[PDB]
Amino acid sequence: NFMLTQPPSVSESPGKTVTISCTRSSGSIASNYVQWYQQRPGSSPTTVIYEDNQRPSGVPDRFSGSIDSSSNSASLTISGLKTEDEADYYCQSYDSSNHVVFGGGTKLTVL
Amino acid sequence: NFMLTQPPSVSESPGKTVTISCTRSSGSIASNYVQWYQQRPGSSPTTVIYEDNQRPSGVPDRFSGSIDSSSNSASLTISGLKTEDEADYYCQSYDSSNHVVFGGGTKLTVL
């Protein structure tokens, strides 16, 4: 149906801002909601964003989501980088067909 | 809303059968569909089962899903164990507030 493409890595120093893009290969990004997950080594995925830009309870406002119709992409922005933010990040949407599609994953290193 | 609890680990010899369970903490397991993912180290989650028991194209019939009461659980069964099956396995469903819920994950070791 479609793929979601992510850069395999990003790094940044503590206190800085980092952006991770998720690009949909076919059909419009805005046809279905985008979610973002944080995964630490040995643990399960943790929702940081759902419905393109909503934060679950307990997720700090350092985490934000946005959609760019024109590049057919979603982005996750992390400001005030802390060393605990080091983790894998995945974007995720639906098919229509309805079925889940995961992006390839971005490994974030805090320098 | 609810949690999905899984055993942290399972192990078994090549050619054998292993079962991994997923237990819902409140509400019925049958209220929403259950999905299973395989995740190898360094990679993103791959669907092995969706809609309780459906296999995506290219997933071998060694992988099967089922659902039970009396215990409020879903299970993933892997027959004919191969050393490539070594990975983490996650169950996943939806609340009604619709939002995704992930299990804690099971690490499968092939002996």
Side-chain angles (χ1 to χ4, degrees), chain A residues 68-97:
Chain A
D68 181 43
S69 35
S70 40
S71 61
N72 214 46
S73 68
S75 299
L76 180 71
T77 303
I78 314 159
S79 71
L81 255 190
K82 297 185 188 174
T83 69
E84 67 205 52
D85 297 339
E86 174 150 345
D88 292 297
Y89 298 83
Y90 302 93
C91 61
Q92 177 262 315
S93 195
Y94 298 101
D95 107 12
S96 107
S97 220

PDB file of all heavy atoms in Angstrom, chain A residues 68-97:
ATOM      1  N   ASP A  68       3.280  18.170   7.061  1.00  0.00           N
ATOM      2  CA  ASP A  68       3.586  19.084   5.960  1.00  0.00           C
ATOM      3  C   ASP A  68       3.048  18.458   4.701  1.00  0.00           C
ATOM      4  O   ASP A  68       3.649  17.557   4.144  1.00  0.00           O
ATOM      5  CB  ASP A  68       5.089  19.344   5.843  1.00  0.00           C
ATOM      6  CG  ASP A  68       5.430  20.304   4.714  1.00  0.00           C
ATOM      7  OD1 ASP A  68       4.725  21.325   4.568  1.00  0.00           O
ATOM      8  OD2 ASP A  68       6.357  20.031   3.952  1.00  0.00           O
ATOM      9  N   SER A  69       1.880  18.926   4.298  1.00  0.00           N
ATOM     10  CA  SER A  69       1.164  18.350   3.154  1.00  0.00           C
ATOM     11  C   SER A  69       2.016  18.390   1.892  1.00  0.00           C
ATOM     12  O   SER A  69       1.997  17.472   1.056  1.00  0.00           O
ATOM     13  CB  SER A  69      -0.186  19.055   2.911  1.00  0.00           C
ATOM     14  OG  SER A  69      -0.105  20.445   3.216  1.00  0.00           O
ATOM     15  N   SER A  70       2.797  19.444   1.774  1.00  0.00           N
ATOM     16  CA  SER A  70       3.469  19.616   0.527  1.00  0.00           C
ATOM     17  C   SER A  70       4.643  18.673   0.265  1.00  0.00           C
ATOM     18  O   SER A  70       4.846  18.282  -0.865  1.00  0.00           O
ATOM     19  CB  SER A  70       3.836  21.075   0.242  1.00  0.00           C
ATOM     20  OG  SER A  70       4.296  21.757   1.388  1.00  0.00           O
ATOM     21  N   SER A  71       5.420  18.306   1.282  1.00  0.00           N
ATOM     22  CA  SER A  71       6.397  17.208   1.173  1.00  0.00           C
ATOM     23  C   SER A  71       5.818  15.822   1.539  1.00  0.00           C
ATOM     24  O   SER A  71       6.550  14.821   1.564  1.00  0.00           O
ATOM     25  CB  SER A  71       7.617  17.497   2.058  1.00  0.00           C
ATOM     26  OG  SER A  71       7.232  17.591   3.424  1.00  0.00           O
ATOM     27  N   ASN A  72       4.506  15.752   1.791  1.00  0.00           N
ATOM     28  CA  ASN A  72       3.826  14.498   2.152  1.00  0.00           C
ATOM     29  C   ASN A  72       4.461  13.830   3.402  1.00  0.00           C
ATOM     30  O   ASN A  72       4.615  12.613   3.494  1.00  0.00           O
ATOM     31  CB  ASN A  72       3.735  13.541   0.935  1.00  0.00           C
ATOM     32  CG  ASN A  72       2.448  12.699   0.917  1.00  0.00           C
ATOM     33  OD1 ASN A  72       1.360  13.230   1.141  1.00  0.00           O
ATOM     34  ND2 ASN A  72       2.565  11.403   0.624  1.00  0.00           N
ATOM     35  N   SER A  73       4.844  14.642   4.374  1.00  0.00           N
ATOM     36  CA  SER A  73       5.597  14.145   5.522  1.00  0.00           C
ATOM     37  C   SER A  73       4.962  14.543   6.876  1.00  0.00           C
ATOM     38  O   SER A  73       4.137  15.476   6.974  1.00  0.00           O
ATOM     39  CB  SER A  73       7.074  14.587   5.431  1.00  0.00           C
ATOM     40  OG  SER A  73       7.196  16.012   5.596  1.00  0.00           O
ATOM     41  N   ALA A  74       5.289  13.776   7.903  1.00  0.00           N
ATOM     42  CA  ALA A  74       5.017  14.181   9.279  1.00  0.00           C
ATOM     43  C   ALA A  74       6.379  14.392   9.906  1.00  0.00           C
ATOM     44  O   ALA A  74       7.334  13.757   9.472  1.00  0.00           O
ATOM     45  CB  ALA A  74       4.303  13.103   9.988  1.00  0.00           C
ATOM     46  N   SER A  75       6.464  15.258  10.927  1.00  0.00           N
ATOM     47  CA  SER A  75       7.676  15.401  11.732  1.00  0.00           C
ATOM     48  C   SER A  75       7.443  15.314  13.258  1.00  0.00           C
ATOM     49  O   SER A  75       6.445  15.800  13.764  1.00  0.00           O
ATOM     50  CB  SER A  75       8.395  16.738  11.394  1.00  0.00           C
ATOM     51  OG  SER A  75       8.798  16.796  10.009  1.00  0.00           O
ATOM     52  N   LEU A  76       8.410  14.725  13.977  1.00  0.00           N
ATOM     53  CA  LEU A  76       8.508  14.807  15.446  1.00  0.00           C
ATOM     54  C   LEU A  76       9.636  15.742  15.844  1.00  0.00           C
ATOM     55  O   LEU A  76      10.764  15.555  15.397  1.00  0.00           O
ATOM     56  CB  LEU A  76       8.743  13.432  16.079  1.00  0.00           C
ATOM     57  CG  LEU A  76       8.879  13.355  17.619  1.00  0.00           C
ATOM     58  CD1 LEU A  76       7.578  13.595  18.316  1.00  0.00           C
ATOM     59  CD2 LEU A  76       9.468  11.966  18.022  1.00  0.00           C
ATOM     60  N   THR A  77       9.322  16.762  16.647  1.00  0.00           N
ATOM     61  CA  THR A  77      10.316  17.717  17.119  1.00  0.00           C
ATOM     62  C   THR A  77      10.527  17.519  18.615  1.00  0.00           C
ATOM     63  O   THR A  77       9.554  17.513  19.368  1.00  0.00           O
ATOM     64  CB  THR A  77       9.915  19.186  16.794  1.00  0.00           C
ATOM     65  OG1 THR A  77       9.709  19.320  15.378  1.00  0.00           O
ATOM     66  CG2 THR A  77      10.978  20.189  17.230  1.00  0.00           C
ATOM     67  N   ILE A  78      11.786  17.311  19.016  1.00  0.00           N
ATOM     68  CA  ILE A  78      12.169  17.301  20.435  1.00  0.00           C
ATOM     69  C   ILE A  78      13.073  18.496  20.798  1.00  0.00           C
ATOM     70  O   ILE A  78      14.205  18.597  20.327  1.00  0.00           O
ATOM     71  CB  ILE A  78      12.859  15.967  20.863  1.00  0.00           C
ATOM     72  CG1 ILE A  78      12.096  14.750  20.329  1.00  0.00           C
ATOM     73  CG2 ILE A  78      12.986  15.897  22.387  1.00  0.00           C
ATOM     74  CD1 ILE A  78      12.896  13.541  20.266  1.00  0.00           C
ATOM     75  N   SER A  79      12.558  19.394  21.634  1.00  0.00           N
ATOM     76  CA  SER A  79      13.344  20.528  22.134  1.00  0.00           C
ATOM     77  C   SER A  79      13.883  20.226  23.528  1.00  0.00           C
ATOM     78  O   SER A  79      13.410  19.275  24.193  1.00  0.00           O
ATOM     79  CB  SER A  79      12.507  21.808  22.158  1.00  0.00           C
ATOM     80  OG  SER A  79      11.524  21.746  23.184  1.00  0.00           O
ATOM     81  N   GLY A  80      14.866  21.037  23.961  1.00  0.00           N
ATOM     82  CA  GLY A  80      15.544  20.884  25.258  1.00  0.00           C
ATOM     83  C   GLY A  80      16.090  19.492  25.469  1.00  0.00           C
ATOM     84  O   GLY A  80      15.884  18.915  26.537  1.00  0.00           O
ATOM     85  N   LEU A  81      16.799  18.960  24.466  1.00  0.00           N
ATOM     86  CA  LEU A  81      17.249  17.568  24.477  1.00  0.00           C
ATOM     87  C   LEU A  81      17.907  17.174  25.782  1.00  0.00           C
ATOM     88  O   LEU A  81      18.826  17.863  26.237  1.00  0.00           O
ATOM     89  CB  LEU A  81      18.253  17.311  23.351  1.00  0.00           C
ATOM     90  CG  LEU A  81      17.841  16.541  22.098  1.00  0.00           C
ATOM     91  CD1 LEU A  81      19.084  16.241  21.305  1.00  0.00           C
ATOM     92  CD2 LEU A  81      17.061  15.233  22.418  1.00  0.00           C
ATOM     93  N   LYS A  82      17.454  16.058  26.353  1.00  0.00           N
ATOM     94  CA  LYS A  82      18.043  15.464  27.544  1.00  0.00           C
ATOM     95  C   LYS A  82      18.621  14.105  27.181  1.00  0.00           C
ATOM     96  O   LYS A  82      18.139  13.461  26.227  1.00  0.00           O
ATOM     97  CB  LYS A  82      16.996  15.278  28.643  1.00  0.00           C
ATOM     98  CG  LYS A  82      16.394  16.577  29.150  1.00  0.00           C
ATOM     99  CD  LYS A  82      15.465  16.275  30.323  1.00  0.00           C
ATOM    100  CE  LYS A  82      14.687  17.505  30.749  1.00  0.00           C
ATOM    101  NZ  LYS A  82      13.688  17.148  31.782  1.00  0.00           N
ATOM    102  N   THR A  83      19.612  13.644  27.963  1.00  0.00           N
ATOM    103  CA  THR A  83      20.249  12.372  27.642  1.00  0.00           C
ATOM    104  C   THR A  83      19.288  11.174  27.706  1.00  0.00           C
ATOM    105  O   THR A  83      19.503  10.184  26.992  1.00  0.00           O
ATOM    106  CB  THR A  83      21.574  12.097  28.429  1.00  0.00           C
ATOM    107  OG1 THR A  83      21.291  11.871  29.810  1.00  0.00           O
ATOM    108  CG2 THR A  83      22.548  13.234  28.270  1.00  0.00           C
ATOM    109  N   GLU A  84      18.222  11.284  28.509  1.00  0.00           N
ATOM    110  CA  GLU A  84      17.175  10.249  28.583  1.00  0.00           C
ATOM    111  C   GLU A  84      16.300  10.094  27.299  1.00  0.00           C
ATOM    112  O   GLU A  84      15.555   9.133  27.163  1.00  0.00           O
ATOM    113  CB  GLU A  84      16.303  10.523  29.803  1.00  0.00           C
ATOM    114  CG  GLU A  84      15.470  11.822  29.677  1.00  0.00           C
ATOM    115  CD  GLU A  84      15.074  12.432  31.034  1.00  0.00           C
ATOM    116  OE1 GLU A  84      15.980  12.630  31.892  1.00  0.00           O
ATOM    117  OE2 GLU A  84      13.870  12.736  31.234  1.00  0.00           O
ATOM    118  N   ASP A  85      16.368  11.076  26.405  1.00  0.00           N
ATOM    119  CA  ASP A  85      15.644  11.089  25.128  1.00  0.00           C
ATOM    120  C   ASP A  85      16.303  10.137  24.100  1.00  0.00           C
ATOM    121  O   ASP A  85      15.664   9.754  23.115  1.00  0.00           O
ATOM    122  CB  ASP A  85      15.585  12.515  24.552  1.00  0.00           C
ATOM    123  CG  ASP A  85      14.818  13.493  25.434  1.00  0.00           C
ATOM    124  OD1 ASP A  85      14.000  13.073  26.272  1.00  0.00           O
ATOM    125  OD2 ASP A  85      15.023  14.707  25.285  1.00  0.00           O
ATOM    126  N   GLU A  86      17.575   9.792  24.336  1.00  0.00           N
ATOM    127  CA  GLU A  86      18.277   8.772  23.558  1.00  0.00           C
ATOM    128  C   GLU A  86      17.495   7.430  23.516  1.00  0.00           C
ATOM    129  O   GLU A  86      17.208   6.831  24.572  1.00  0.00           O
ATOM    130  CB  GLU A  86      19.712   8.600  24.082  1.00  0.00           C
ATOM    131  CG  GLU A  86      20.509   7.442  23.446  1.00  0.00           C
ATOM    132  CD  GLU A  86      22.029   7.678  23.373  1.00  0.00           C
ATOM    133  OE1 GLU A  86      22.488   8.825  23.540  1.00  0.00           O
ATOM    134  OE2 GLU A  86      22.776   6.712  23.104  1.00  0.00           O
ATOM    135  N   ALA A  87      17.148   7.002  22.291  1.00  0.00           N
ATOM    136  CA  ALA A  87      16.168   5.939  22.056  1.00  0.00           C
ATOM    137  C   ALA A  87      15.934   5.796  20.554  1.00  0.00           C
ATOM    138  O   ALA A  87      16.425   6.649  19.774  1.00  0.00           O
ATOM    139  CB  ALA A  87      14.861   6.292  22.748  1.00  0.00           C
ATOM    140  N   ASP A  88      15.188   4.752  20.156  1.00  0.00           N
ATOM    141  CA  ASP A  88      14.616   4.687  18.790  1.00  0.00           C
ATOM    142  C   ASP A  88      13.247   5.390  18.730  1.00  0.00           C
ATOM    143  O   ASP A  88      12.459   5.298  19.695  1.00  0.00           O
ATOM    144  CB  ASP A  88      14.500   3.235  18.285  1.00  0.00           C
ATOM    145  CG  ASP A  88      15.877   2.588  18.048  1.00  0.00           C
ATOM    146  OD1 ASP A  88      16.643   3.072  17.172  1.00  0.00           O
ATOM    147  OD2 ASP A  88      16.197   1.605  18.758  1.00  0.00           O
ATOM    148  N   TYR A  89      12.983   6.078  17.606  1.00  0.00           N
ATOM    149  CA  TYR A  89      11.673   6.716  17.349  1.00  0.00           C
ATOM    150  C   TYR A  89      11.018   6.211  16.085  1.00  0.00           C
ATOM    151  O   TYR A  89      11.657   6.193  15.024  1.00  0.00           O
ATOM    152  CB  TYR A  89      11.754   8.259  17.363  1.00  0.00           C
ATOM    153  CG  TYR A  89      12.200   8.795  18.741  1.00  0.00           C
ATOM    154  CD1 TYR A  89      13.558   8.847  19.103  1.00  0.00           C
ATOM    155  CD2 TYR A  89      11.245   9.249  19.658  1.00  0.00           C
ATOM    156  CE1 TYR A  89      13.945   9.322  20.353  1.00  0.00           C
ATOM    157  CE2 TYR A  89      11.598   9.728  20.911  1.00  0.00           C
ATOM    158  CZ  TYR A  89      12.939   9.755  21.274  1.00  0.00           C
ATOM    159  OH  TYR A  89      13.260  10.238  22.533  1.00  0.00           O
ATOM    160  N   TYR A  90       9.749   5.788  16.200  1.00  0.00           N
ATOM    161  CA  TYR A  90       8.999   5.289  15.017  1.00  0.00           C
ATOM    162  C   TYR A  90       7.748   6.111  14.703  1.00  0.00           C
ATOM    163  O   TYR A  90       6.991   6.463  15.614  1.00  0.00           O
ATOM    164  CB  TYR A  90       8.603   3.815  15.187  1.00  0.00           C
ATOM    165  CG  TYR A  90       9.782   2.855  15.412  1.00  0.00           C
ATOM    166  CD1 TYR A  90      10.200   2.520  16.718  1.00  0.00           C
ATOM    167  CD2 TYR A  90      10.477   2.298  14.335  1.00  0.00           C
ATOM    168  CE1 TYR A  90      11.288   1.660  16.939  1.00  0.00           C
ATOM    169  CE2 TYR A  90      11.564   1.414  14.552  1.00  0.00           C
ATOM    170  CZ  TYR A  90      11.966   1.120  15.848  1.00  0.00           C
ATOM    171  OH  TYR A  90      12.991   0.233  16.101  1.00  0.00           O
ATOM    172  N   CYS A  91       7.527   6.411  13.413  1.00  0.00           N
ATOM    173  CA  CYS A  91       6.233   6.942  12.975  1.00  0.00           C
ATOM    174  C   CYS A  91       5.357   5.784  12.550  1.00  0.00           C
ATOM    175  O   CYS A  91       5.861   4.716  12.311  1.00  0.00           O
ATOM    176  CB  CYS A  91       6.376   7.993  11.865  1.00  0.00           C
ATOM    177  SG  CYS A  91       7.133   7.422  10.341  1.00  0.00           S
ATOM    178  N   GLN A  92       4.043   5.999  12.507  1.00  0.00           N
ATOM    179  CA  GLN A  92       3.052   4.946  12.304  1.00  0.00           C
ATOM    180  C   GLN A  92       1.731   5.574  11.846  1.00  0.00           C
ATOM    181  O   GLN A  92       1.283   6.604  12.395  1.00  0.00           O
ATOM    182  CB  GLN A  92       2.823   4.115  13.590  1.00  0.00           C
ATOM    183  CG  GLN A  92       1.730   3.020  13.455  1.00  0.00           C
ATOM    184  CD  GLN A  92       0.379   3.435  13.983  1.00  0.00           C
ATOM    185  OE1 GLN A  92       0.283   4.001  15.052  1.00  0.00           O
ATOM    186  NE2 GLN A  92      -0.672   3.137  13.258  1.00  0.00           N
ATOM    187  N   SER A  93       1.133   4.962  10.818  1.00  0.00           N
ATOM    188  CA  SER A  93      -0.195   5.357  10.350  1.00  0.00           C
ATOM    189  C   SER A  93      -1.025   4.099   9.918  1.00  0.00           C
ATOM    190  O   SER A  93      -0.722   2.980  10.352  1.00  0.00           O
ATOM    191  CB  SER A  93      -0.075   6.477   9.281  1.00  0.00           C
ATOM    192  OG  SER A  93      -1.313   7.118   9.058  1.00  0.00           O
ATOM    193  N   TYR A  94      -2.078   4.295   9.128  1.00  0.00           N
ATOM    194  CA  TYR A  94      -3.041   3.237   8.730  1.00  0.00           C
ATOM    195  C   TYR A  94      -3.095   3.434   7.222  1.00  0.00           C
ATOM    196  O   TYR A  94      -3.291   4.524   6.754  1.00  0.00           O
ATOM    197  CB  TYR A  94      -4.367   3.437   9.447  1.00  0.00           C
ATOM    198  CG  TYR A  94      -4.236   3.342  10.939  1.00  0.00           C
ATOM    199  CD1 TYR A  94      -4.185   4.499  11.713  1.00  0.00           C
ATOM    200  CD2 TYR A  94      -4.153   2.088  11.586  1.00  0.00           C
ATOM    201  CE1 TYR A  94      -4.073   4.433  13.077  1.00  0.00           C
ATOM    202  CE2 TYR A  94      -4.021   2.008  12.992  1.00  0.00           C
ATOM    203  CZ  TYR A  94      -3.977   3.196  13.719  1.00  0.00           C
ATOM    204  OH  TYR A  94      -3.866   3.186  15.092  1.00  0.00           O
ATOM    205  N   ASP A  95      -2.966   2.404   6.412  1.00  0.00           N
ATOM    206  CA  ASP A  95      -3.810   1.968   5.332  1.00  0.00           C
ATOM    207  C   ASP A  95      -5.214   2.186   4.829  1.00  0.00           C
ATOM    208  O   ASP A  95      -5.306   2.380   3.682  1.00  0.00           O
ATOM    209  CB  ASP A  95      -3.046   0.966   4.464  1.00  0.00           C
ATOM    210  CG  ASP A  95      -3.522  -0.449   4.638  1.00  0.00           C
ATOM    211  OD1 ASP A  95      -4.590  -0.652   5.260  1.00  0.00           O
ATOM    212  OD2 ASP A  95      -2.809  -1.359   4.147  1.00  0.00           O
ATOM    213  N   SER A  96      -6.318   2.143   5.511  1.00  0.00           N
ATOM    214  CA  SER A  96      -7.604   2.307   4.721  1.00  0.00           C
ATOM    215  C   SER A  96      -8.486   1.118   4.298  1.00  0.00           C
ATOM    216  O   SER A  96      -9.609   1.034   4.808  1.00  0.00           O
ATOM    217  CB  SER A  96      -7.496   3.166   3.407  1.00  0.00           C
ATOM    218  OG  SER A  96      -7.571   2.367   2.201  1.00  0.00           O
ATOM    219  N   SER A  97      -8.028   0.143   3.500  1.00  0.00           N
ATOM    220  CA  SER A  97      -7.708  -1.249   3.899  1.00  0.00           C
ATOM    221  C   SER A  97      -7.673  -1.576   5.360  1.00  0.00           C
ATOM    222  O   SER A  97      -7.712  -2.735   5.743  1.00  0.00           O
ATOM    223  CB  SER A  97      -6.566  -1.878   3.119  1.00  0.00           C
ATOM    224  OG  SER A  97      -6.903  -3.229   2.842  1.00  0.00           O
TER     225      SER A  97
END
